[PDB]
Structure formats: C-alpha cells, structure tokens
Amino acid sequence: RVDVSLPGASLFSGGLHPITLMERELVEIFRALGYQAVEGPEVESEFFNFDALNIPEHHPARDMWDTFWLTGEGFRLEGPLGEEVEGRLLLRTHTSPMQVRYMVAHTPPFRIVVPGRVFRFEQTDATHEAVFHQLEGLVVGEGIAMAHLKGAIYELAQALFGPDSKVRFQPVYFPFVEPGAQFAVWWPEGGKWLELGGAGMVHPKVFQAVDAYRERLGLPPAYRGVTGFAFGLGVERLAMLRYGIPDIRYFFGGRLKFLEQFKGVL
Amino acid sequence: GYQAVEGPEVESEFFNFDALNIPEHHPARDMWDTFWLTGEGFRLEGPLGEEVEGRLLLRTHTSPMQVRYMVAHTPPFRIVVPGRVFRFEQTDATHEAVFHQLEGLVVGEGIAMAHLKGAIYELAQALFGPDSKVRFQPVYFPFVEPGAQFAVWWPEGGKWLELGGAGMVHPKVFQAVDAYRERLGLPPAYRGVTGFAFGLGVERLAMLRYGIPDIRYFFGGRLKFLEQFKGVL
C-alpha cells in the first residue's frame, strides 16, 4: 500500500511580517482613493526633518520628537533631485519630510501615501517603541480643502472598520499644518475611540520652503496657488488592534513562533 | 476607485440579451454569434442567489454582469468586471471563439459622458504614457446611448488601437433592472441616476503589450510559451 495521509515532502512555507500586512492594507486602501505610494530615506537632514516643516531650532515644538543625532564622515545623503545634500544628520522622527522631498521633485495636483521606518529616543515598553512605522498622506492642488481631509479619513475608517464606523476630528497643533487636527476612529467590536493620527491643511510656510528650495535647484515655483492636506498615521498601533497583538516589542523580536502566526492573513 | 466583481460564464438569455435591450429576432443580435446550451437539472443562480430560469447560453460579453450587479447593489458605485466570454467564430490568428473582456460600469447621480472620456483618458495615460491620447467616435450598442467606440494612440507604434465600446447606460437597462428588483421584492434604485459603461477586449491588448503574434497561443498549453512570462513583475 501507500499510506496516503503520511506527511509529504516538508517544503518551506514563507510568510509576511505583521507590519508588512498592515502597511499593505493601508496603501491598498489609499491607492483606491487614488494615492500613489513613494518612500524616503531613513537617514535625514535636520533641514528636511525639521526646518522645512516649520520646526525651528530651540523651538518648544521639537520636544514632540525625541531625536537620534548621527555622526559620521564620508556619507552622501542624496536630496530630492539626487543632488548631494548637506546638513546635520539624524534619523527620521516622522515620515513627514518625505512630503517636502516629494513636492520639490514633482508638481500639483497629486495624491501620495508614504510608509516608512521612523525613529525616536524613547523607552521600549509594551505600547511604545523607539523604532516604529508611520504612514503619511499628502494631497495638494487647486481647490483642495479640509472637507477632503475629513473625506479621506472617513473613507479610511469605513474600510478598516466597516459601516458601523465613524470618525472624530479635534483641533490640535503641528507646526507644518494649520488648521491642524488629531483624528480618531470608532471601532464597533471594541466600543472604543482610536486616536489614529494627526493631520491638517499643509502650512503656508511649508509650501514656501519647498518653492524656495526649488529655486536653489533652478526649478520653477509650483506651490503659490494651491492648497493641501496631509496626515500622519502610526501603523503598529493599528496592526495591534487588527491582528490582536498585545505587545509592540514583538514586531522587532525575530520570534518565529510569533512571525509564523501571520502566514495565513490573506 | 473601481472595484472588481465577477459573473457566471453560463448565462440566461434574459441577462445576456433581454435586459441589455437586445431583443429576440433583432438584427442587433448578429454582433454576437452565440453558443446555445442544453442540459437538465442545472441550477443557474441569479443576482440574489435565487434559482433563475431562462434559455441557457454562454456569455457573449461580460455585459450581463452589470445588470446582475445593479440588481444586487445600489448607486453610486464603480465596478470593473473581467471574465471569460464565448463566441461561435473561426479560430484564426487575430480571432478567438473564447477570449476575455473587461467591463466598466459607473452609475450615480450626476455621472456624465465627460466622466466616461475621463476614465478612458486615464486608462490610456497608464497603459501608454503621456505621449498617449484617446479617440471617441459614435457607434451603436443597444444597451447604451449615446454610444461610442474608443481608440487609444500608442506612440512606439504610431498606431490607433480600437480598444472597446462604451456609452451612457441605456434608459431601458435601468428600467429592466428596477423591474427585476420589484419581482425580487426590492425597492427601485435607478430612477434618478445616470451611468456610463465600457467593454474592453483583453487579448488584443495583451498582444500589443507582451508582443504576442498569435491569439491561439493563450489557449494552447505550450509551456515554452507560458514560461516566457514568469518575469513580468
């Protein structure tokens, strides 16, 4: 005979990382609203991470970002046009610089969503990491308004949580956005308000910064008569609610017994 | 913002023809050389999973899927429906008896022909780059008026591709679905909405893209042929 239940040639089954799944659903969701996804460098200049986003030196707004400062000689940190950029080096504290980046290299109107690994000098506990992921949004063009920001988030929420879901917007402060705002989503099987991310209408001084950088590069102004809305949305938090993960520290851990648990998901 | 749904390959004449304003013994049915099927004890399930009756055939186009969908959902929506489709025709090098179509349907308040053109313009930009442009010409389909054929301009070919047909979904189609709805006990949903559909044949397009000289290859099983496409993305 040939015992037909007898285990077969055990080949390797691959899998994706929790964050990858979550990042994916995220971009998939936004690309159906016409957002295209681009990435940026993890090692950034202070000019892109801070100055171009209206976060100035010795300003009390920089305390929202506990920053890793890097040193090192002979390291080409390439700018939006591949030009060699100078400036005091650091690790991205948010993906936000990518939108100054992108705006210099392209022209309105556009929709983009940018994922990335981001860094903060913070104490690794169970609901906090020193290294985690953000997903940015930027929609710039003539006529764009805050109604469209709300619309986007409303759309995000509908897709991540179903019809029984609703979104909440509250004023809050970011230097690179005014009117600024924090947004929360209502998740039915939890009866809970999720603080998801921050957002707003991209700040006049940001547009100014990019058009200025443009000139230095010899490019034409492109952001004098357009408006925009950006948002920043933290991904681990969201992945935790979705896959039911009790501890953020797991993501960076390497535990196969952990990773393997996600082979199924789609 | 189009979402993709599918439909059955074995269809009723009601869905493949009658609900699309293609009536019996009408000279418009000659655009569709049809396979008629026979067979006993075969549940052909309708939009709501209800057992449907009617003379059975093979889809001559994916178009029925949009009557299908409209009965089961409510406006506004964007859908794109792929499918295998059949025609009684002589298998040569630029013709198949079995090939694929991709349908579009965008229905809702305010939808207009400018949006149809916009879609196609968008299609073309993405398949062919900026140097591309689209051409629209009036043409006749019973399920659409104003109706139209559309062609795309493909730079590295200096050629106009006749890609597919389209138009503003016909008043009698909306009527047909809302009627079917009543029979199913559902409320009317298409009295005050407009729509645009398009039908776009896929082998043709794949041939231009992957450089395939002969449509017969697709249904052939030649590994030496299939294998040639492992790379692509």
Add this chain to the structure above:
Amino acid sequence: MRVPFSWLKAYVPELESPEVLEERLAGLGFETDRIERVFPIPRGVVFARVLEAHPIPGTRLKRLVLDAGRTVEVVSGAENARKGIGVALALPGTELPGLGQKVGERVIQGVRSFGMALSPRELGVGEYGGGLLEFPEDALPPGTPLSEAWPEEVVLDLEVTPNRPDALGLLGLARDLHALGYALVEPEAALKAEALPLPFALKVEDPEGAPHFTLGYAFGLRVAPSPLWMQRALFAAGMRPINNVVDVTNYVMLERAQPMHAFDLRFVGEGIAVRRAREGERLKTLDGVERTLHPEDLVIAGWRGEESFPLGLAGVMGGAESEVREDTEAIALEVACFDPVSIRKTARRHGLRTEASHRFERGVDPLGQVPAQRRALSLLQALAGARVAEALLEAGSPKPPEAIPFRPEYANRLLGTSYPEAEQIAILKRLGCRVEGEGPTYRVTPPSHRLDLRLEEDLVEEVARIQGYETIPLALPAFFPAPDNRGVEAPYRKEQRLREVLSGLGFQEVYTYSFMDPEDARRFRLDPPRLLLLNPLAPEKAALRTHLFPGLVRVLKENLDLDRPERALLFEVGRVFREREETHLAGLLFGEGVGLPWAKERLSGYFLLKGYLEALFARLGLAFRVEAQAFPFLHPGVSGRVLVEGEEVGFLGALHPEIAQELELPPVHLFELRLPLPDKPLAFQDPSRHPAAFRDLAVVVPAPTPYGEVEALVREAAGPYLESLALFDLYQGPPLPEGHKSLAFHLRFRHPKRTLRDEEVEEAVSRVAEALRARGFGLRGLDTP
C-alpha cells in the same frame, strides 16, 4: 456599403475630398474600411456604335461593323453583341488591366478584328464578363475616349450600423452631412403625370407582412441601356446595369434606402396580390434558380381568372419571368415597406441575401414609399420616356412618428457639455425633426426615416455627434460609494492571491478551453457532462468541462509530443460545470522531480505533490490533510480526498495507470478542488516565555493503519498542553510483528504562565499510553532524552 464619392457629391456638392469625407463620416458614426480608386480607362478605349452585327458562317461568332469615328470591324462571341447599341471599343495598342497582354488587331475566323469590344470585366468596371458593356447608341460622338465621359471614381467602403437603416441610402448619408452644415441637394422629381385608371388592381391579403404597399403605373416605355452617368454610378456601387427601368429601380434604392421592383404587366393579369405563399408553390427567381416556397414566405403574386401565381419573392428577389426586358412596354412598380422579421426568416430560409432584403431587414422609412414612387416614376419618364398615371394603388395607413420630450439642459447634463440651447435646437432641425414649444422641455418629433429616434437620450446623441464627440470635455467623478458596495471585491481578490501565492510556490499556470470532449467522460472515467452544445465548434468541443484535470493531462501530452520537457508543475483555475457553475483549482506534477540535476537522489511523485500542497496551505493558514477514498480516475493505491480545515473539497492522487495507458504517458500526479477556499480568521496565540519539555517515543502499529488515525489519536489524548507533534522516522522490518511498523514521533510540551513539571509530563504522556495501548498499539521506544 460602397459609397461612391461623385455620387454622394451630387447631393452634397461642397464635399472637400474623399478623405475629409472619410473623417467626416467617422464623427457621424460611420467607419470606412477602405478607400478605393476604381475606373482607370486608357486612351485606347473609345465609344463606338454598332452599325451592323454579322454572324460568321460556321462559328458562334459575329462580325461587328462599328462606327468608331472611322468604320472598323471586330469579331465578338458575345450573346448581347448586336446592332443599335453603343460599345466600349479597345483599339490596337491599348493596355487593359484585365488581360495583361496587349490589344492588337488579330485575325479571327476570316476577319481582322481591329481590337475588341469590352465586357465589364475586360474594361475593369465590374466582375461580369458574360457580355458586352452596352451603352446608349448616342451616348457620345463616335470615336471619343470613354475617359472623357467615364472619369475615375473613388469609392469608400462604409459600415452602416443596424440603428441607421436610413444610411443604406446615399441621400441618407447626405442628410447627416447636411447637419454638419454642408449644403444638401435633394433630387427634384419632375413628373408630367396623366389622369387615368390603372389597368390592374391590388389585393393585399396580408397587412401583417406589408403594412404599407404601393404600386405605380408606367406605360409606353422605351427600354434601352442607361445613360453613361448611371451605368458609372451603379458599377461603382457594386451593381451591374441591366437597362433603363431596372437600373432606375436599383439607382433609387441605393439613393434612399428603398428597394423596389418593376413587374412587366404582361404577366400580372388582373392584379398584383401581396400574400403568403401556398405550400409547395414554386417560383423561378431572377438569379435563375427554381425554388419551392414556404407558407411563411410572403410573395408578390398575380392573378387571372381563378389562377393565382407567384411573381416574385417579396422584398428579396423578383421572379425571372416578369423581369423587365427590351420588349416590355408597361410595368407595375412595387414600392413598399415589409415586415422585417418575415423577410429575415424568408431570406435565411432560402439562402438569399440581397440589397433588397437587408434593407427590409434593417428597416425602411414607413412613409417613404410615395416620395420614392415619384422619384422612380420621374426617372422612368426622363430615361425611358415613360408615361405615368397620377394615381398610385396604395394599401396601409402608417402613422407619423410621435413627438419626443427634449430638454437641452438634460442634454448638456447627460454629456457634461455646455452647448447653447439655440445650437441644440438648430442641429435637431437640420436633421429634419420638428421642434415645437418654448422650453424648458421641447416637443420634438423626428422625420419618419429615423427609425432610431424614439427617446430623449436618442436626441442627445444626436446633438453630441453633430456637435462632435471631441467637444465633450474630460472629467473625473467624485462620490462616496453606497454602503452595499463595500468590500464587494473581497472574493475576486481572494482568488488572485491564491494564483499569486501559487506562482511563488512553484506552480505554472495554464488556461484550458471550457469545452470538453463528450468521449472524455468515458476516457478519464467521469460522470457525464450535464451541459451540451446545441452547436459546438466540433464534436470534441461539444460539452462543458466538468473537471479541470482532464484538460491538464491532455495538455501535458500535448507538449511532451512537442518539447519533450523532463518535468512539470502546472496549475489551472477555471469555472467548471455541473449542477451549478463552480470555481475550481487543479494542479499537476510529473517526471523526475527535484534535487541536484547532477546527483541522483530525488523527491517526486505523490509526496512531492502533497509536500508542495501542505506548504501552500501552510501559507494560506489553513489546516490540510488527505485520507483514503478511491476516485474512478485515480490509482486505487494512490487515492485521497483533500480536507482543508476539516471539510472535503476535492482529491489528491496519482493518475490511473489504465488511463495513463490509453493516453500514452508516464505516472502523472494531480489534484482538484472547489473554490473558494475556506477562510480561517486569526486567533493570535500569544506564545510562552517559559521553556518547553521535549521527549520522544515511537508507536508500533499494523501496516494498513493510515498515518492519520494514529497522529489524530496521539494528538487528541496527548493533551491541552502539546506543541510540536511530528513524525521523524518510518521503519519497517525486524524485530516487529511479522510485517507491522513503528512510527518515530517528536514531541514537545509547554505552559503559558507557569513552567512544565516532570510530573505533568510523564503523566499526560502515559494518558496517551492509555488510548494508544487500549486500541491495539504500544511503544517500540519510550522516554528517550
């Protein structure tokens, strides 16, 4: 539809050129497949008069004495060659297209033929080669080049879509062009009529078939060749001239999409009767074939006394007997509207497609007969010296078209355009509609001839194309989609991942026809197919696929015979047909297997498959095992049902050798199963920080016992604290019970909070010793660190 530039130019004088006409018709909704230039006629072809025709004694040939400026002779074998007509004379030296060799004076049966008279084929204007081209004897002065009265034409090949039957008349087309703003010239139909009775009546016994039917009366006809300009026009449109009255009926028709027929009164008797045909009734039609009519066929018949006889096959083809010839002095002119369906049926029933039918299938202007009668009568008067009565015989009272509500605002709204009302309303008028009222919503009634104008949105297409599809802006819609449409794409997406994970796994996908060979059900040993083709491409393609795998097998054969590949791992996803339409996924293995192509060890056959598969499901996150169950198309030794997440979904196995036999191939391994695959939701299992407990011990079990039952048993009793349960050695032989077997099992335990004490282990494993020995098993090994 052949559309000859110069002919259209008669109705629409201002046309710029064949090419801007091509692009003009394009925007109107009419695509041109080709543009051809047609009548190249050399210097050597002159017009000539036949003074006398003289039979050549002993031959079937005639000596033609021609006035061609000077007098000349030629010899002709042509039936119609005869005195009193004009001919096209090719002189010595002439290079003709349709003969390649030159034209000289040669000698034929005693007489020097100074060139030859031409057939339509010889000249190059028509396919016909059975007779001389025949012209009016006076058409030209003798000797003049034909070119001078027969210029080259360009003719566009237009497709005319079923909704535009009016476009099956050139004057139809002209009207469209007219709406673009080109000037129109409708032909004036000059009739000098006479008040007097028609010497025949009309009895239409089937208003069903002929809702409108008219007869005109023309008498004192001088039947003769058509003028040059008509012969030229007709030849350009793909028809061949016959004479005078016949040609006029074809010329009108091509003009205004209105087939018509002149019956010679000789054969008409007391009257024309438009009626159904009596069973078996016979009729020799124009094309000269004897036919046998069907009761459903509508005939144009005549009667005399108690005699009733078919005269033509209504709306399709006239009879042969009553066709108008040189000796006809009077005719009844049939000009009617017929039942499109009836004509359609008749036509297919007889294997006839004509310009006459076709137009009657597509449909003709329900009120055009009378305007048509006049045009024809007029021409007949002009070209055949017809005298014609004032009265027509007429039967049928067709109603005018109804008005259609039309709102310029809806028009602009439906299109996205911004056309000024005034412009909309004017275009609508140019196309010939009446438009009453002051707005916002208009009373607008179309011309009878636009069959395609019934609805308000019909009218909008009408302003759109006249205005230009190019004048429609581009735009994108914005809207929050309705809730019932949410995640409506889940299924489609699910299936695409399947495919994609499959490519990543190592599987090659293949598309197979949905058809199946009915004989194949026997071959691969399947229950019969339930769906059959009332009209297959061929008997091998006469049913509907009940399984994916047969096609997989048949396709392996197909490229073993071609590219002799050494191994394959195929997969197909297709719709299959039985009871209901369902989605299936089938896979296929074969050949040496996998390893080091230079070494010898290989993994292949059944467990290679099962290995690839349990890996697949590893990735989909679904539980997977296969049990023992025969399948008519498998090995009775390699046969399993597939069990994903505990429910049966198809089969895994190795082809039946007896079928491998019949189809002439090595052992193939396949699987087939129902989609969609069961979903399993994440139940994330927070691991355990605290260490695990390892120990091994094998199980001695009878040979036939399926690995499943044991694994199952070891597991189910092993306890609420087990981890990796897996098999790591199959040994068979001494010193085991005369042919039994032991299974080497790796075990591991663990506890979430606390840690595992040796107490809770050795116990719970002896609790497995319980249901294991108490079933007929026992341990070859025990407690091995």
Add this chain to the structure above:
Amino acid sequence: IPLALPAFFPAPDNRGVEAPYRKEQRLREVLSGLGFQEVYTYSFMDPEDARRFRLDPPRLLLLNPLAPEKAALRTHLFPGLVRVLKENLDLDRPERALLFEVGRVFREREETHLAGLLFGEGVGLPWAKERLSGYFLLKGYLEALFARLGLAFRVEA
C-alpha cells in the same frame, strides 16, 4: 465641516511614480510564495559586531544611542539575521529556518538590501532520511526566485 472627495487629473510628472515601491512589494510577496519567512530587525548595530562578523567599520554612529550595543547603523542585513537565529534556537529550538529580511542599510549612501538565511536538516520526508540542504538548497531556492523574476542568475568564486 462637511465630508467630501476631490476629483482631479494628476499632473504628468506624478505618473507611475509608485513603480519602485510596487517593485519591492512583489519581491517580498514572491518571496513568501517561494518559502521564505520575513523578519524585521532593528536598524541599529553593535559596533563590536563589525569585528565579530568581520565587517568594515560602520560609518554612521549615534551621538546618543539607546545603549552601546545599539550605538551605530546597520551596514549589513545578515548579522541581524544570524543573531536572530541564535535568539530563537535558545528559545523554541526549531529544527530548521528559511528567513528573509529587507531593510535599509547604511554605508556611503543609504541603500535597500535583501538578505536570506537557511539552516538545519533541510527538506525531504521527515520520516525518511534523504535530505536537500546547506549551500545548494539555498542556491536552489534562489535560482528559482530569479526564475520567477525573469532574471539571469549565477554565482562565482
């Protein structure tokens, strides 16, 4: 504030601007299909590790690390792969692994890297004895990967 969605034809320079991102996602996905397990590793590196795994030194250093072991920037993906195999041999004693990581690495310029990792008995019939493993198992999985990406693949000395 009302809800709303924007409509606009995007500017040309923005076309197919997502090609790169998409390219990398397929890589990952084809990789899962192939049989590889993915893992995220910190971007930090232990400066002592350069000696250990025998690498040229790291060029980017932390003016303020979480700790000395996390005081520099990853120059290679693989050290972290190795260190993570250790980490769950000491925990769940797995018998074999096929890991893959994609991460940004730091040296001269920031570049995207893909690293893979094999180990253990290999693959075959867990009850039989014959196995495929070690180097050619890797190279086998790999030339298969590139089979699917449609790229030519070979390795030299």
